Amino acid sequence: VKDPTLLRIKIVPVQPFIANSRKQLDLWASSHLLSMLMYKALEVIVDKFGPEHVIYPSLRDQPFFLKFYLGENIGDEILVANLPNKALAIVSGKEAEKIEEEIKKRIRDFLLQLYREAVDWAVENGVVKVDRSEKDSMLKEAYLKIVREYFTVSITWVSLSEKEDIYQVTENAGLSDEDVKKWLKFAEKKENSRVLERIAIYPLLVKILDSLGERKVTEERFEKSEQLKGWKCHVCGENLAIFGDMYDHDNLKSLWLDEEPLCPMCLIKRYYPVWIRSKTGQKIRFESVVDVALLYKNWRKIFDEKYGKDLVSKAREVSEDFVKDNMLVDSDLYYSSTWESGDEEKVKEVVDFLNAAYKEIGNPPKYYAILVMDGDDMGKVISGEVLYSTPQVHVAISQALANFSIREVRSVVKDEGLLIYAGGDDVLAILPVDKALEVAYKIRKEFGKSFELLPGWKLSAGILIVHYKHPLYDALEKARDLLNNKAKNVPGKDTLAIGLLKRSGSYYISLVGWELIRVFYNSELRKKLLEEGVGKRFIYHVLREVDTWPKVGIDEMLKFEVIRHIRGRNKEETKELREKIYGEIKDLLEHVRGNNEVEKVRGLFTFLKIITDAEVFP
Amino acid sequence: MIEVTFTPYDVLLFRESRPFDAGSESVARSIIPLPQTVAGAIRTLLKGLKNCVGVGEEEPEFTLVGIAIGTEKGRIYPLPFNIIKSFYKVVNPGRFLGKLILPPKGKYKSGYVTESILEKYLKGELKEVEENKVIRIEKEKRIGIKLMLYTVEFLRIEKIYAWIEDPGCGIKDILSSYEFLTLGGESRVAFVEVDDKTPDIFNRELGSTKKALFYFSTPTIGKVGEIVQELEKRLNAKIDDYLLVSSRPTAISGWDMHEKKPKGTKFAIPPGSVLFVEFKEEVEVPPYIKLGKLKKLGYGLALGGIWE
Numbered sequence A: 001v002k003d004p005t006l007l008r009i010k011i012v013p014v015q016p017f018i019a020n021s022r023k024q025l026d027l028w029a030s031s032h033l034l035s036m037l038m039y040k041a042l043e044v045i046v047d048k049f050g051p052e053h054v055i056y057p058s059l060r061d062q063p064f065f066l067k068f069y070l071g072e073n074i075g076d077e078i079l080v081a082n083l084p085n086k087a088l089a090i091v092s093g094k095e096a097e098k099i100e101e102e103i104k105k106r107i108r109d110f111l112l113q114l115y116r117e118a119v120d121w122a123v124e125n126g127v128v129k130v131d132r133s134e135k136d137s138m139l140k141e142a143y144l145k146i147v148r149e150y151f152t153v154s155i156t157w158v159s160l161s162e163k164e165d166i167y168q169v170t171e172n173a174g175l176s177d178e179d180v181k182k183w184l185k186f187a188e189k190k191e192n193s194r195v196l197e198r199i200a201i202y203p204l205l206v207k208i209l210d211s212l213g214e215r216k217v218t219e220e221r222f223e224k225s226e227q228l229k230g231w232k233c234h235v236c237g238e239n240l241a242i243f244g245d246m247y248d249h250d251n252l253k254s255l256w257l258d259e260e261p262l263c264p265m266c267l268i269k270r271y272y273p274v275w276i277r278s279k280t281g282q283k284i285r286f287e288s289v290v291d292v293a294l295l296y297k298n299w300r301k302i303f304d305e306k307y308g309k310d311l312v313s314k315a316r317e318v319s320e321d322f323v324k325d326n327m328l329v330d331s332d333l334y335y336s337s338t339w340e341s342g343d344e345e346k347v348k349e350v351v352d353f354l355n356a357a358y359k360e361i362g363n364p365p366k367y368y369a370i371l372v373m374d375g376d377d378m379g380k381v382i383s384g385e386v387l388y389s390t391p392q393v394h395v396a397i398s399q400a401l402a403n404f405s406i407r408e409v410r411s412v413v414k415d416e417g418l419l420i421y422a423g424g425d426d427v428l429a430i431l432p433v434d435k436a437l438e439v440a441y442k443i444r445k446e447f448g449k450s451f452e453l454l455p456g457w458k459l460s461a462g463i464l465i466v467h468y469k470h471p472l473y474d475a476l477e478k479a480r481d482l483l484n485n486k487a488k489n490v491p492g493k494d495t496l497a498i499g500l501l502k503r504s505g506s507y508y509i510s511l512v513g514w515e516l517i518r519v520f521y522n523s524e525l526r527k528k529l530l531e532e533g534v535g536k537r538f539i540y541h542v543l544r545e546v547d548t549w550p551k552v553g554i555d556e557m558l559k560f561e562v563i564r565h566i567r568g569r570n571k572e573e574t575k576e577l578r579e580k581i582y583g584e585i586k587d588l589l590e591h592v593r594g595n596n597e598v599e600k601v602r603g604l605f606t607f608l609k610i611i612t613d614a615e616v617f618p
Numbered sequence B: 001m002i003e004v005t006f007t008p009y010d011v012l013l014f015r016e017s018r019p020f021d022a023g024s025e026s027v028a029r030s031i032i033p034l035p036q037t038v039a040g041a042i043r044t045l046l047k048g049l050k051n052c053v054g055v056g057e058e059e060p061e062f063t064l065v066g067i068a069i070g071t072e073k074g075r076i077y078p079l080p081f082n083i084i085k086s087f088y089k090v091v092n093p094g095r096f097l098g099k100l101i102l103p104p105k106g107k108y109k110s111g112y113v114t115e116s117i118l119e120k121y122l123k124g125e126l127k128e129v130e131e132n133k134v135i136r137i138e139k140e141k142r143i144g145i146k147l148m149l150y151t152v153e154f155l156r157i158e159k160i161y162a163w164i165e166d167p168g169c170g171i172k173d174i175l176s177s178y179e180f181l182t183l184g185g186e187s188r189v190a191f192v193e194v195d196d197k198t199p200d201i202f203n204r205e206l207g208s209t210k211k212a213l214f215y216f217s218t219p220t221i222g223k224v225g226e227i228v229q230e231l232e233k234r235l236n237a238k239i240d241d242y243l244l245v246s247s248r249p250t251a252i253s254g255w256d257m258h259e260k261k262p263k264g265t266k267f268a269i270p271p272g273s274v275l276f277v278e279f280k281e282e283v284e285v286p287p288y289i290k291l292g293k294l295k296k297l298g299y300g301l302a303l304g305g306i307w308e
């Protein structure tokens, strides 16, 4: 690096792209492809300056880096998306402009490449039943334009060696406070001068570059062109669907598998999974949310071990399309209701068979959970730590984060669910409802060990529990909302927001501190609710007692209610049990968010109402 | 400029032949008739108005200056994108490398604000907004059936305001002869009130300055550079620098009634975005200005503001 220049890479859009998905596979594909775009961008920087010049994210142990650059033989860990959509690196000033243009190009070409490969794959597999000439229309400018313009890869940079009046640079950038002016003072101290080199105020420079960078990103993301008129994609309903400008709605639908016309971007999305398979021989263990749901209490395994064979038999009987590789094509065929709506008498056998199995093994899990985690105030906590030595401590921080995301997050999830993204302090995972809480807790705990009553490094999270039939787009929106508007809205953050969205539309939300999970798990209250509808009316009555302040006060009302619903086998047991349950309720109240005792009881009992719902936790 | 005020109501299609009355009795449902009521659809008026709506034409002859929503508190608008949450703080542009930038001060948290507050904001008199002054609109939940079940959600709203510039279509007279009008592509009907005056928010006087701002109150269609260009020519002033505070583009579709097909997708700067401009010489900031494409369909309504 001749003339050191700080460079920032930003790739958008993120959440809107991930949310435009119908199946878990699309969701994983969007996320993974996003990480892939960042990787393509970073390799441009590595080629010219090596990984040591990439401050964030930390490439060193990045699966993508080990397998696609240093060419190693890493396994399924390659399936996880570990690279965030933003990066910071130090490069050469005279090279920066080339690098900018160079990154926009490799990302553009890569996407067009995936698109053409997707068109070929689509036609050769029935995805789209079209002519021979019509296949060439799929590659016309109109569709190519959509691929080329969907993502924005923005790069901005600033010289680390140019000198400037530190006070005036931060003042003009709207960053001058007392704490900042004080820091600037100690800086003017070290170097007997106020006119220092940009890297002299590195911590404040990162923040400024972020703003300069954001200005550019909004200017570039709006430089889009219009699209041709026509029917839109069924998955995102935003972009023109291929052949959407040549056919009427009905004829357009008949050309596509499952009758769902796709736009250029969602076609790449459907193809991405196979592309990755061909490139790494790897594919995600759970492809549908239903696959993640059936992991509840090992139902899937259990059922397969005592009904797996026959079901496939009776399935193949009704039809040969439902079976393949001696296993069902879709996991939803595990639900009686699927056969009744999606050779009549030949089907009656399947339904009666499944219903019968549910009698001995129990009804199949129909709810699953979406876990989103995200570091609280990382921007301030990082610059605070960093506040030519500074950049090094920043690299150290980034490596600590990549290590955590790549090895530790992966370790608690194991094969208990699907870990889609883990880019440092942030996480996106699909888990069976009976693992969600524990998994989130462990990730929060590990995070605390890797960065250490009043912790400075915290993670907030959103856990949304939904029915397998719920539109994934809406579920992601609600999971994000639980994280951003509920958990992150609590003063002091470091909160877990739990939402249960029933198929009926009812929506229950509880805001809790992390330790509620520990205290509840080890509680006598938890054991007593599981062996009781005593739990249901106890929860109903307490909630009714806190729609307003109870005249007799919270403590007295809780003791009264505990007495009315909690009982043992003999006066001896029941007394100790009532004293134990009462005390655990009080300990739990310590960990529920809320402006007062009434709100805390409400939140706790709403939480209890959630984890004792028989439909969700059969 | 006429001001049309809509009071929307959902339509409940009831049958005189029903199975169990215990149901509607438990809900205490009452069905009272509405005598002498003048209903009608916008799909029928668009009644001689054929002379102002081009057949196969994208825009009409008249111009829909814009649309604003209202609750019990009156007219409300998206909280300006440069107002960050902590209390909500107003953050003005800073500078670096000679370029206008938005200093980092927290995440934007969406919400609405009353015309009163927006008015103080546009005059540069607003430093912060107490959180209880920021509005959050509850979503309405409906089960949609196209004419497959759908999930239809939309803001819980009391009023819809439409500002119209009529070159000579006699729109005020047509609308004034109706009390109710059913909306487009929905089982919703609305009461119609028409006032022959232009709203205060458009008659403001900001004076003259070099540091002006433009708040996008309706989605504005166009690339940033184009909008900044149109602004320079419209105000006959040169812009030395600008900053667009926004989120991401919003996809605008539309139905092409002539083609019996959906219109091509267009991308727009969303309502709430603010364009900060620094002119070479003083300009007298207009109270409002129309920018971008499809102006006649309500897009491009920008309200003039000031900053220092």
Ligand SMILES: Nc1ncnc2c1ncn2[C@@H]1O[C@H](COP(=O)(O)OP(=O)(O)OP(=O)(O)O)[C@@H](O)[C@H]1O
Pocket (backbone or CB within 6 Å): A011, A012, A013, A014, A015, A016, A018, A030, A031, A032, A034, A035, A081, A083, A084, A085, A374, A421, A423, A426, A428, B247, B248
């Ligand atoms: N590849 C990914 N897969 C899943 N989550 C990701 C991925 N990349 C980033 N993320 C998460 O998404 C967050 C950003 O979401 P968002 O949609 O707000 O993007 P943004 O960079 O803020 O762009 P915008 O200006 O559109 O908001 C990142 O901070 C990170 O937490």
Ligand SMILES: Nc1ncnc2c1ncn2[C@@H]1O[C@H](COP(=O)(O)OP(=O)(O)OP(=O)(O)O)[C@@H](O)[C@H]1O
Pocket (backbone or CB within 6 Å): A056, A086, A088, A374, A375, A376, A377, A378, A379, A380, A382, A397, A398, A401, A424, A488, A493, B107
């Ligand atoms: N290791 C890092 N080094 C430099 N920047 C980082 C690093 N890790 C993350 N970042 C940046 O910090 C940003 C924080 O984004 P986010 O939207 O989460 O804000 P936050 O500061 O974490 O506050 P909160 O999450 O509480 O709203 C990440 O999106 C990324 O842009």
Ligand SMILES: [Mg+2]
Pocket (backbone or CB within 6 Å): A374, A375, A376, A377, A378
């Ligand atoms: Mg964060």
Ligand SMILES: [Mg+2]
Pocket (backbone or CB within 6 Å): none
């Ligand atoms: Mg964002």
Ligand SMILES: [Zn+2]
Pocket (backbone or CB within 6 Å): A233, A234, A235, A236, A237, A238, A239, A262, A263, A264, A265, A266, A267
């Ligand atoms: Zn699409």
